[PDB]
Protein backbone atom coordinates (compact mmCIF):
# COMPACT_ATOMS: atom_id res chain seq x y z
CA UNK A 1 0.00 0.00 0.00
CA UNK A 2 2.81 2.69 0.35
CA UNK A 3 3.71 4.11 -2.94
CA UNK A 4 5.28 7.54 -2.20
CA UNK A 5 7.42 8.74 0.48
CA UNK A 6 7.41 12.50 0.24
CA UNK A 7 10.11 14.34 1.74
CA UNK A 8 9.98 18.15 2.29
CA UNK A 9 8.70 21.36 4.78
CA UNK A 10 5.04 21.14 6.03
CA UNK A 11 4.39 24.36 6.87
CA UNK A 12 1.49 26.85 8.04
CA UNK A 13 0.79 30.00 5.71
CA UNK A 14 -1.34 32.40 7.07
CA UNK A 15 -2.49 35.14 4.01
CA UNK A 16 -3.29 38.63 4.77
CA UNK A 17 -5.16 40.00 2.33
CA UNK A 18 -5.93 42.86 0.56
CA UNK A 19 -2.75 44.69 2.18
CA UNK A 20 -0.37 47.22 1.25
CA UNK A 21 1.96 49.31 3.28
CA UNK A 22 -0.79 51.28 4.43
CA UNK A 23 -1.60 48.71 7.13
CA UNK A 24 1.34 50.68 9.34
CA UNK A 25 0.06 54.46 9.23
CA UNK A 26 -2.97 53.02 11.74
CA UNK A 27 -3.07 51.78 15.40
CA UNK A 28 -5.43 48.59 14.08
CA UNK A 29 -6.15 47.51 10.76
CA UNK A 30 -9.18 45.20 10.26
CA UNK A 31 -9.32 42.44 7.88
CA UNK A 32 -12.07 40.54 7.02
CA UNK A 33 -10.67 37.16 7.81
CA UNK A 34 -7.75 35.63 9.03
CA UNK A 35 -6.78 32.38 9.12
CA UNK A 36 -4.17 29.60 8.98
CA UNK A 37 -3.81 26.67 6.57
CA UNK A 38 -1.16 23.81 5.80
CA UNK A 39 1.11 24.48 2.82
CA UNK A 40 4.40 23.60 1.77
CA UNK A 41 4.54 21.63 -1.29
CA UNK A 42 5.33 18.42 0.76
CA UNK A 43 2.20 18.71 1.93
CA UNK A 44 0.50 19.48 -0.83
CA UNK A 45 1.76 16.78 -3.04
CA UNK A 46 1.23 14.17 0.13
CA UNK A 47 -2.30 15.60 -0.17
CA UNK A 48 -3.31 15.14 -3.55
CA UNK A 49 -1.40 11.79 -4.13
CA UNK A 50 -3.09 10.56 -1.21
CA UNK A 51 -6.70 11.84 -2.73
CA UNK A 52 -5.75 10.21 -6.28
CA UNK A 53 -5.75 6.91 -4.69
CA UNK A 54 -2.06 6.07 -3.87
CA UNK A 55 -1.04 5.39 -0.15
CA UNK A 56 1.71 8.14 0.85
CA UNK A 57 4.00 9.07 3.92
CA UNK A 58 5.68 12.24 4.91
CA UNK A 59 9.09 12.89 5.58
CA UNK A 60 9.74 16.37 7.10
CA UNK A 61 10.48 18.49 10.72
CA UNK A 62 7.64 20.11 12.30
CA UNK A 63 7.74 21.79 16.39
CA UNK A 64 6.03 20.02 19.11
CA UNK A 65 3.59 22.91 18.89
CA UNK A 66 0.05 23.90 17.97
CA UNK A 67 0.93 24.57 14.35
CA UNK A 68 3.05 20.86 14.14
CA UNK A 69 -0.62 19.53 15.58
CA UNK A 70 -2.24 21.18 13.33
CA UNK A 71 -0.17 19.75 10.05
CA UNK A 72 -0.35 16.01 11.92
CA UNK A 73 -4.54 16.48 12.34
CA UNK A 74 -4.55 17.49 8.69
CA UNK A 75 -2.10 14.39 7.26
CA UNK A 76 -4.52 11.96 9.84
CA UNK A 77 -7.47 13.24 7.79
CA UNK A 78 -5.80 12.58 4.34
CA UNK A 79 -4.67 9.51 5.14
CA UNK A 80 -1.06 10.29 4.83
CA UNK A 81 1.71 8.01 6.71
CA UNK A 82 3.13 10.30 9.79
CA UNK A 83 5.69 7.72 11.53
CA UNK A 84 8.14 9.02 10.13
CA UNK A 85 7.85 12.68 10.88
CA UNK A 86 8.68 13.71 14.22
CA UNK A 87 8.29 16.95 16.34
CA UNK A 88 11.02 18.64 17.58
CA UNK A 89 10.75 20.63 20.89
CA UNK A 90 14.00 22.93 20.42
CA UNK A 91 11.75 24.38 17.27
CA UNK A 92 9.39 26.35 16.17
CA UNK A 93 7.01 24.80 13.44
CA UNK A 94 7.40 26.83 10.00
CA UNK A 95 4.71 29.75 10.42
CA UNK A 96 4.65 31.40 6.41
CA UNK A 97 2.71 35.47 6.44
CA UNK A 98 1.56 36.07 3.20
CA UNK A 99 1.26 39.84 2.30
CA UNK A 100 -1.40 39.72 -0.51
CA UNK A 101 -1.64 42.95 -2.62
CA UNK A 102 -5.16 44.56 -4.12
CA UNK A 103 -3.49 43.39 -7.34
CA UNK A 104 -3.17 39.46 -6.28
CA UNK A 105 0.40 39.64 -6.19
CA UNK A 106 2.17 38.63 -2.34
CA UNK A 107 5.60 39.29 -0.78
CA UNK A 108 6.62 36.88 2.64
CA UNK A 109 7.44 37.31 6.17
CA UNK A 110 9.25 34.22 7.41
CA UNK A 111 10.93 32.36 10.42
CA UNK A 112 14.22 32.22 9.35
CA UNK A 113 14.89 29.74 11.84
CA UNK A 114 11.70 27.79 11.20
CA UNK A 115 11.32 23.93 10.80
CA UNK A 116 11.67 24.56 6.83
CA UNK A 117 15.10 26.13 7.31
CA UNK A 118 16.25 23.25 9.92
CA UNK A 119 14.83 20.09 7.99
CA UNK A 120 17.97 18.18 6.82
CA UNK A 121 18.73 14.27 6.33
CA UNK A 122 18.53 13.40 10.05
CA UNK A 123 14.80 13.71 9.22
CA UNK A 124 14.75 11.05 6.42
CA UNK A 125 14.13 7.30 7.15
CA UNK A 126 16.17 5.65 5.21
CA UNK A 127 15.22 2.40 6.55
CA UNK A 128 11.99 3.03 5.00
CA UNK A 129 12.66 3.38 1.42
CA UNK A 130 12.44 -0.54 0.98
CA UNK A 131 8.80 0.09 1.67
CA UNK A 132 7.24 2.52 -1.09
CA UNK A 133 7.66 2.74 -5.06
CA UNK A 134 8.82 6.18 -5.71
CA UNK A 135 10.04 9.39 -3.84
CA UNK A 136 9.27 12.85 -4.08
CA UNK A 137 11.83 15.20 -3.20
CA UNK A 138 9.63 18.28 -2.24
CA UNK A 139 11.76 21.20 -3.37
CA UNK A 140 15.16 20.53 -3.74
CA UNK A 141 16.56 24.78 -2.31
CA UNK A 142 13.19 24.58 -0.53
CA UNK A 143 15.45 23.31 2.81
CA UNK A 144 19.09 24.88 2.48
CA UNK A 145 20.67 21.94 4.10
CA UNK A 146 19.32 19.60 2.13
CA UNK A 147 21.94 20.75 -0.35
CA UNK A 148 23.62 18.59 -3.26
CA UNK A 149 25.78 16.27 -1.12
CA UNK A 150 22.96 15.22 1.03
CA UNK A 151 20.41 14.88 -1.86
CA UNK A 152 23.17 12.66 -3.50
CA UNK A 153 22.98 10.41 -0.61
CA UNK A 154 19.16 10.49 -0.33
CA UNK A 155 18.92 9.37 -3.65
CA UNK A 156 22.12 6.85 -3.83
CA UNK A 157 19.99 5.49 -0.99
CA UNK A 158 16.72 5.60 -3.21
CA UNK A 159 18.13 3.77 -6.48
CA UNK A 160 19.62 1.13 -4.34
CA UNK A 161 15.92 0.28 -3.49
CA UNK A 162 14.73 0.66 -7.55
CA UNK A 163 12.64 3.72 -6.26
CA UNK A 164 11.36 6.30 -8.85
CA UNK A 165 12.91 9.48 -8.15
CA UNK A 166 10.75 12.43 -8.84
CA UNK A 167 11.76 16.15 -8.14
CA UNK A 168 10.21 19.97 -8.09
CA UNK A 169 12.49 22.60 -7.39
CA UNK A 170 12.28 26.17 -6.16
CA UNK A 171 14.40 29.75 -6.63
CA UNK A 172 17.68 28.48 -4.68
CA UNK A 173 17.67 30.71 -1.17
CA UNK A 174 21.16 30.98 -0.54
CA UNK A 175 22.65 31.65 -4.02
CA UNK A 176 23.08 28.04 -4.94
CA UNK A 177 24.25 27.20 -8.69
CA UNK A 178 23.00 24.15 -10.63
CA UNK A 179 26.45 23.23 -10.50
CA UNK A 180 26.22 22.48 -6.76
CA UNK A 181 23.34 19.87 -7.08
CA UNK A 182 24.16 18.65 -10.77
CA UNK A 183 25.53 15.39 -9.48
CA UNK A 184 22.39 15.06 -6.96
CA UNK A 185 20.57 15.43 -10.36
CA UNK A 186 22.20 12.41 -11.99
CA UNK A 187 19.71 10.01 -9.98
CA UNK A 188 16.53 11.63 -10.57
CA UNK A 189 14.05 10.51 -12.90
CA UNK A 190 11.53 12.88 -13.41
CA UNK A 191 12.11 16.64 -12.82
CA UNK A 192 9.60 19.05 -12.61
CA UNK A 193 10.75 22.79 -12.97
CA UNK A 194 9.07 25.39 -13.35
CA UNK A 195 9.48 27.33 -16.50
CA UNK A 196 10.45 30.80 -14.82
CA UNK A 197 12.58 29.66 -12.15
CA UNK A 198 14.31 27.34 -14.65
CA UNK A 199 14.79 30.24 -16.89
CA UNK A 200 16.60 32.08 -13.94
CA UNK A 201 18.99 28.96 -12.81
CA UNK A 202 19.73 28.00 -16.69
CA UNK A 203 20.36 31.28 -18.18
CA UNK A 204 18.41 30.19 -20.71
CA UNK A 205 15.54 31.64 -23.13
CA UNK A 206 13.89 28.56 -24.99
CA UNK A 207 12.26 25.41 -23.09
CA UNK A 208 14.84 22.94 -25.01
CA UNK A 209 18.07 24.80 -23.90
CA UNK A 210 16.79 25.63 -20.88
CA UNK A 211 15.88 21.67 -20.61
CA UNK A 212 19.01 20.34 -21.45
CA UNK A 213 20.87 22.12 -18.93
CA UNK A 214 19.11 19.50 -17.03
CA UNK A 215 19.45 16.68 -19.55
CA UNK A 216 23.24 17.68 -18.92
CA UNK A 217 23.23 16.77 -15.28
CA UNK A 218 21.91 13.75 -15.75
CA UNK A 219 18.23 13.85 -15.28
CA UNK A 220 16.37 11.01 -17.13
CA UNK A 221 13.39 13.58 -17.77
CA UNK A 222 12.85 17.05 -17.84
CA UNK A 223 8.76 17.71 -17.25
CA UNK A 224 8.28 21.66 -17.92
CA UNK A 225 4.69 23.22 -17.01
CA UNK A 226 4.08 25.91 -19.39
CA UNK A 227 0.99 27.81 -18.20
CA UNK A 228 -1.31 27.82 -21.09
CA UNK A 229 -0.44 25.40 -23.54
CA UNK A 230 -0.08 22.48 -21.27
CA UNK A 231 3.57 20.83 -20.52
CA UNK A 232 7.09 20.57 -22.52
CA UNK A 233 8.68 17.00 -21.41
CA UNK A 234 12.26 16.60 -22.89
CA UNK A 235 14.57 13.47 -22.82
CA UNK A 236 18.00 12.84 -24.54
CA UNK A 237 15.97 11.21 -27.36
CA UNK A 238 12.76 13.04 -27.13
CA UNK A 239 11.03 16.25 -26.98
CA UNK A 240 6.93 16.18 -26.35
CA UNK A 241 4.85 18.41 -26.01
CA UNK A 242 0.88 18.08 -24.91
CA UNK A 243 -0.85 21.01 -24.73
CA UNK A 244 -3.10 22.11 -20.76
CA UNK A 245 -6.97 21.28 -21.45
CA UNK A 246 -8.21 23.92 -23.29
CA UNK A 247 -11.47 25.45 -21.36
CA UNK A 248 -10.47 26.75 -18.37
CA UNK A 249 -10.21 30.07 -16.70
CA UNK A 250 -9.45 29.38 -13.38
CA UNK A 251 -9.47 31.89 -10.00
CA UNK A 252 -6.16 30.71 -8.52
CA UNK A 253 -2.95 29.24 -9.38
CA UNK A 254 -0.95 28.71 -6.23
CA UNK A 255 -0.52 25.12 -5.86
CA UNK A 256 -0.86 24.32 -9.57
CA UNK A 257 2.58 22.74 -9.49
CA UNK A 258 2.08 20.58 -6.67
CA UNK A 259 -1.37 19.08 -8.07
CA UNK A 260 0.18 19.00 -11.79
CA UNK A 261 3.36 16.58 -10.19
CA UNK A 262 0.49 14.53 -8.19
CA UNK A 263 -1.59 13.93 -10.81
CA UNK A 264 1.99 12.71 -13.05
CA UNK A 265 3.50 10.88 -9.99
CA UNK A 266 -0.62 9.02 -9.70
CA UNK A 267 -0.08 8.68 -13.50
CA UNK A 268 3.54 7.02 -13.11
CA UNK A 269 2.32 4.58 -10.74
CA UNK A 270 -0.59 3.17 -12.51
CA UNK A 271 1.72 2.61 -15.44
CA UNK A 272 0.62 4.74 -17.63
CA UNK A 273 2.77 6.18 -20.66
CA UNK A 274 4.37 9.73 -20.64
CA UNK A 275 1.39 10.78 -22.71
CA UNK A 276 -0.51 9.67 -20.50
CA UNK A 277 0.88 10.97 -17.29
CA UNK A 278 1.32 14.48 -18.96
CA UNK A 279 -2.76 14.54 -19.07
CA UNK A 280 -3.14 13.43 -16.11
CA UNK A 281 -1.20 15.86 -14.57
CA UNK A 282 -2.67 18.60 -16.89
CA UNK A 283 -6.07 17.23 -16.32
CA UNK A 284 -5.38 17.67 -12.28
CA UNK A 285 -3.68 20.94 -12.24
CA UNK A 286 -6.83 21.98 -14.38
CA UNK A 287 -8.86 21.45 -11.44
CA UNK A 288 -6.79 23.06 -8.64
CA UNK A 289 -6.79 26.02 -10.66
CA UNK A 290 -10.75 26.49 -10.55
CA UNK A 291 -10.67 26.74 -6.81
CA UNK A 292 -9.51 28.92 -4.15
CA UNK A 293 -6.01 27.51 -2.57
CA UNK A 294 -3.64 24.63 -4.13
CA UNK A 295 -5.83 21.48 -2.29
CA UNK A 296 -9.29 22.73 -2.42
CA UNK A 297 -10.12 21.93 -5.72
CA UNK A 298 -9.21 18.48 -6.11
CA UNK A 299 -11.09 16.69 -3.76
CA UNK A 300 -10.88 13.18 -4.74
CA UNK A 301 -10.11 11.81 -8.54
CA UNK A 302 -13.16 11.10 -10.51
CA UNK A 303 -13.32 15.30 -10.79
CA UNK A 304 -10.27 14.84 -12.86
CA UNK A 305 -10.54 11.30 -15.07
CA UNK A 306 -14.04 13.41 -15.64
CA UNK A 307 -11.79 15.37 -18.06
Given at each position: ???VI???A ?6 LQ ?18 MT ?6 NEAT??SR??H????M???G???A?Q????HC?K??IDIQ??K?DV?I???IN?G ?11 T ?5 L ?6 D??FAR ?6 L??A ?5 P ?5 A?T ?6 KA??M??CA?MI?P ?5 L??I ?10 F ?5 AK ?6 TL????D??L???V ?12 F ?5 M?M????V ?18 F????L????L???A????A???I????V ?9 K???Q?
Open positions: NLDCIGAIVDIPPVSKNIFDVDSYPLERIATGGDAIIILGRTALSRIKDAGFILDRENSLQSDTSVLVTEDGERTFVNRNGSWKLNIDVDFSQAKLSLSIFNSLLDGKLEIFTQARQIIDKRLNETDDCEALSYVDYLPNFAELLTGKEDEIACFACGKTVVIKTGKDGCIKRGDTKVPAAGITAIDTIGAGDNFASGIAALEGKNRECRFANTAASVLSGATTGVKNRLVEL
